[PDB]
């Protein structure tokens, strides 16, 4: 199962980086298995972008 | 200054000789000496001029002076028996403002010794810590020309005159003092590594009542921890070091244990002074064990950054120290075990068989009779071999490692000869092995053993003529047959159940909690010197009532008696030879009783179970 | 664990080799993925034993007892035990809310408390919450391994903040509104 | 595994230059961040939807390579319900842009100075850098070089 996750992941990097997303490896693969458990992903679009603003605050 | 020049070609020198990674490293390019391009710093009447033209020309060239370049009207001499350097301002002008120019010139002074130090520490040579040191003080020297930048920007406007420079350069003439006194310190003899990093310590003990330059200090010491703490991340968390420019306390040698590891004291930071001997034991315990295969890396490798006050190197070595002196010790115990072998010595040496060694006697008896070089060593290896394939001593992996060798000499090598006491055992140890448990150690149980074999050789020879003269209506020799074997199997009783086994025991509960070679050398040496110490090898006096009464245990037995010289199935001179082995013991047994008294005990309250013969006569 | 010691025939009534056996708990404990599968692998011949030597003096390691000993809630008449199963009380719990946030409270599913002896009944607990849901729900089983301290580092991400100030109760509050209305506010 | 990784995401987030508790205070702000919001259509068709917004401003190999990948990813969506929403969070010749010249294809097109203005344009865009760090090379150090003494670099306030 862990070869087709990783070929699919390889996959998905390209697609977001032509849509021009603000993910880079770690995010992406964060995401992605956070999203193989299953919730809605319209809120993980909010969230994602609230961490990177919080922990912008900081510097 | 002629000084640096001298200082770089030892440098170069004391790196190639100490490591073999180390060898060419760059030399400084000569060109940016005598070039006057390649550093940092490099007419007309003047008493005939209007006295604004003269504030306007002065101003502007003590404002090139303050970087140590030729102005308009001053010029750059050589420096003189000061340590920064003297200017040349056109004679004529003005006696009210040459006094000025003599205020304004002191942080010129304090820019001079600076930029001349900061392109000295560029090279190579003086090493790549003293070097990030002033490229932190290089940052300073920028500051320095931002301000002269500022002052030509208010000149043009008319708002530069000679008040105003002087006022405006005080920031730069009290955190640039500063600098101008490390920088001819830092310069004096070698310096380089660790030891600038000492120097920059002391700094925040001599500056403790002044908060402005006791956080420079830390801030020029902060940023020169950087490259060290590189090389801090190889030597504590691998088993090897490059280090080619020589920053850093432990060099490597090229000539393993003790030697090619050595702490360089005028190299140490003072932070690290304390944590020195934990550095070098952390590096070296991950050096020793590459050389088997397994783990020289630590799996934890931490992260270091400067603090004082909230200091975090006196808590991440730590945590270095109990990985890799645990990590050593968890691969010697259970593989290349170091405990196996510490049990297969006390199997034969502290003798913890006894079938092994009853077959062996009676099979070797004609052998250790004879003198040496009246005996021969294979054939001792050979009736070992029968005699340990019989007992329990093929049942272990490392049976083998006994070899048959000679000491004739007993007590003038531990304070002819006959075969007992030139008979011996060696234990061997590998290559790895041997680093902890060395040639010394194994002397001393060499020893311990050497003793132990002559109780247990004369207890076989004190029976044989007991059973042999079995005359039968005979009791002449059947007196002093029993008083000495009751001392010689009560030393064997004395020694083996209190001197050899518990403290045996306390040492294999000490290993099992040890957790660094340091603990284990301690204890190793305690139970080895003061079970040797006990028996009669090192004592006091030497303790040769001992030795006097083996032999005439083996006189007794042999070379009189002769097991009643065949009426068991003389001319009465046999019985005055009895009375005098009778007087000769109890004379050596009474005065080793009175020894064991004088010296700051047990054997003496059992042997004299209800206090016999403790009086038959007493010394002067 | 007392209880099947004993019944066993291995002498344990005492205070001091209960921590003996907390401590084996708290840290060599293992348990199995299945009721069925482990005990398979347990019935072929036994070997799921991590030896443990204690330095304390004491010997006491047995592999197949400890993946079994907190199994008995899957099924509580192995023990005994009154109350209610696992599995049932989840989907009662499920059941007893409210219909259309049914699946949005179902889609966060939460380890917490003293059942921390071994993260192994976590995917236990995972594959457990699987085979319960049905196509027509969400799961999501967030699953740290800060589940011991969990009830501290609530607490204290809580106070720290200065907003939370406006759920935290006053002394003038408390005199106006009277003791027992920090029930109501807490929230 | 979730948990490891935003582990891993927290150690990115903190500057390696102590710094064992200030990974804690990001996971503090990091969870704080997290529950803010949760206190408060197929999937390959919000690509469609997209690669239509693409096509519209130019750039046809873009939306022809989007629109067929999709199509063999469902042959996860999720992960592409994530991606439709964080398309506008990201950052703020060879030998073929009009060859005409070689190639085993007809030399036949009229003119219209719009496709080589965007021919132009693909030389501007590396000039507009290259000529905007002539200018923010001396306003940069004009900047730092002139301010008021004692507070032009902060190494003197040390």
Partial sequence: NLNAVRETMDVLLEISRILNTGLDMETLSICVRLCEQGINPEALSSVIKELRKATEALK | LQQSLELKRKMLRDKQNKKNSGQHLPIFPAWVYERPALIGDFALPIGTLPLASQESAVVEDLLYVLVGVDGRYVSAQPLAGRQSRTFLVDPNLDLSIRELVHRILPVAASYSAVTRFIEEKSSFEYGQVNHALAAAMRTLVKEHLILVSQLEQLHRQGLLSLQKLWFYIQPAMRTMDILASLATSVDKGECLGGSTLSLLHDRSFSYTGDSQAQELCLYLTKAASAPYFEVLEKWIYRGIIHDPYSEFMVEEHELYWDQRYTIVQQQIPSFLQKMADKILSTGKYLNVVRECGHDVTCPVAKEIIYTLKERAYVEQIEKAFNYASKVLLDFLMEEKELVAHLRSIKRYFLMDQGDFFVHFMDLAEEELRKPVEDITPPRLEALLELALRMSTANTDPFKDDLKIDLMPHDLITQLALSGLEAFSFDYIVKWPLSLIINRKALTRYQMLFRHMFYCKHVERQLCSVWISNKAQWFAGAFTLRQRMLNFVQNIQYYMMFEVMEPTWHILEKNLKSASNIDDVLGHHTGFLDTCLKDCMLTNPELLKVFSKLMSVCVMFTNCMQKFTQSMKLLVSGFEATINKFDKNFSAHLLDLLARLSIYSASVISRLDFNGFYTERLERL | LMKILTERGYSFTTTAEREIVRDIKEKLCYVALDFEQEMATAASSSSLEKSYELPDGQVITIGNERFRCPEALFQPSFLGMESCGIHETTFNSIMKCDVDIRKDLYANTVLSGGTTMYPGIADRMQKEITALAPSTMKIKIIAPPERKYSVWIGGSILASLSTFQQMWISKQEYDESGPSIVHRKCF | ?158
């Fill in chain 4, 1 to 158: 595994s979730i948990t490891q990784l935003f582990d891993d995401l927290c150690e990115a987030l903190l500057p390696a230059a102590n710094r064992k508790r200030a990974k804690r205070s990001l996971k503090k702000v990091a969870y704080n961040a997290l529950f803010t919001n949760l206190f408060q259509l197929p999937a390959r068709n919000k690509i469609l939807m997209l690669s239509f917004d693409l096509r519209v401003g130019g750039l046809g190999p873009k939306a022809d390579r989007l629109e067929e990948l999709v199509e063999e990813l469902e042959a996860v969506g999720s992960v592409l319900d994530l991606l439709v929403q964080l398309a506008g969070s990201g950052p703020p010749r060879d030998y073929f842009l009009n060859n005409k010249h070689v190639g085993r294809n007809v030399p036949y097109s009229g003119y219209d100075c719009d496709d080589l203005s965007v021919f132009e344009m693909d030389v501007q865009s590396l000039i507009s850098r290259e000529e905007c760090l002539c200018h923010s090379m001396i306003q940069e150090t004009l900047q730092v070089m002139e301010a008021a003494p004692g507070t032009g670099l902060p190494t003197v306030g040390l």
